[PDB]
């Protein structure tokens, strides 16, 4: 499994797709997965949540024409989720944050 910054930001630049230990939201929640019971690694063992797109509301990463952001969760295991996250663009600039999207910075 796959899920640390240096192994993700590098596997995404490479084959342009998350590994597949990850999940949306929405396919975690279809398998039962409750976000207030933590219990993700219970129904969805070994999986991470990833892939869902990423507003950029606060305007925080670099706009683009054409450019959309995603997010993905980074040493998860199990639990509630951490506040680390992986943030791509689909043109592969690789942001990360350690404090729930307040703060970033380039890391490919």
């Given at each position: 499994v796959?899920?640390?910054f240096?192994?993700?930001?590098?596997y995404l630049q490479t084959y342009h797709k998350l590994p597949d230990n990850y999940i949306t939201k929405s396919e975690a929640q279809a398998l039962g997965w409750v976000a207030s019971k933590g219990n993700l690694a219970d129904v969805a063992p070994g999986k991470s949540i990833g892939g869902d797109i990423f507003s950029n509301r606060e305007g925080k990463l670099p706009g683009?024409?054409?450019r959309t952001w995603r997010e993905?969760?980074?040493?998860?295991?199990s639990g509630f989720r951490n506040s680390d996250r992986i943030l791509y663009s689909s043109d592969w600039l690789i942001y990360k944050t350690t404090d729930?999207?307040?703060?970033?910075?380039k890391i490919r």
């Open positions: 796959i899920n640390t240096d192994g993700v930001a590098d683009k024409s054409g993905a969760d980074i040493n998860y295991t729930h999207y307040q703060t970033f910075t």
